Amino acid sequence: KYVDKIHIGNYEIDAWYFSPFPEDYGKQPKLWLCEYCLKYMKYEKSYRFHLGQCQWRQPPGKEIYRKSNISVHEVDGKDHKIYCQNLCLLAKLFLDHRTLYFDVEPFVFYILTEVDRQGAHIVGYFSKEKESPDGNNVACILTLPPYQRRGYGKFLIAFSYELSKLESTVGSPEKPLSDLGKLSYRSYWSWVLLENLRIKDLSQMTSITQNDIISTLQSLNMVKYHVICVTPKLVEEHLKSAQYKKPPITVDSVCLKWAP
Ligand SMILES: CC(C)(COP(=O)(O)OP(=O)(O)OC[C@H]1O[C@@H](n2cnc3c(N)ncnc32)[C@H](O)[C@@H]1OP(=O)(O)O)[C@@H](O)C(=O)NCCC(=O)NCCS
Ligand SMILES: [Zn+2]
């Protein structure tokens, strides 16, 4: 039996994919995860014992962003191996990506949490390969199912580009993108590009690669072969529309503490 249901915090969540937890963990009806240190446990009794004893109330690593009730922690795989391995096992339940089976040490993990008086509760994350030879600025991105459809995905995508900008570099998500990844990236890219029009220049200003700018402007019919072709009025009409709305949660540069 594979792991098919997890309990984490106040949520139970069904699996979407196989994840390589040790076999005896799959055998039980539920896998129980500490929401703060991501330890995985086999029994409600071991879970309850852990909850009473664990001192963690947020992710490890460095808190690098806080705005309203959300915060981001930067977690280097080399520095917090066990945590990042636990994270990857969790994530693999909802992602089919090869990096989830690989060493965590070559990666950095950006953990998104909602903060309240009880703690900083994980809602999603993205991973990033240090010094990616393919210029990938995200490897994996995930919003845990109970938190989906609230704008956290597009926040994580935006955050990944805010780092690329500060690194003075373009980047793209590791391909192939899942269908849900495609929808999310296209939405973000569309908004950013239209605000900027209200290609190498756009690429330099946004850290979005020219290829991803070209494919996005193609969908907006704002490019000829590549040359951008749109009026200010056309751009304003799109930004007025319900199809190219601003992300509900955006990254504020004056709430970030980060250098390359
Ligand atoms: C991709 C993912 C991170 C999006 O997270 P999220 O928090 O739901 O994203 P958002 O709330 O910011 O939504 C982004 C866009 O995706 C659309 N979307 C998200 N889930 C959708 C769904 N199930 N059906 C249709 N549209 C969906 C949203 O409506 C939104 O469109 P809009 O910007 O035009 O309004 C999330 O679906 C996920 O974690 N999936 C599993 C892992 C995965 O596939 N990751 C990406 C792999 S490359
Ligand atoms: Zn714990």
Curated annotation (Swiss-Prot):
Deacetylated by SIRT1. The active site is at 174 (proton donor/acceptor). It is found in: Nucleus; Chromosome; Mitochondrion. The modification N6-acetyllysine is found at residue 98. Keywords: Acetylation, Activator, Acyltransferase, Chromatin regulator, Chromosome, Disease variant, Intellectual disability, Metal-binding, Mitochondrion, Nucleus, Phosphoprotein, Transcription, Transcription regulation, Transferase, Zinc, Zinc-finger. Residues 1-260 are annotated as: Sufficient for interaction with KANSL1. Belongs to the MYST (SAS/MOZ) family. This is Histone acetyltransferase KAT8. The lineage of its organism: Eukaryota, Metazoa, Chordata, Craniata, Vertebrata. The chain holds residues 177 to 447 of 458 of the full protein.
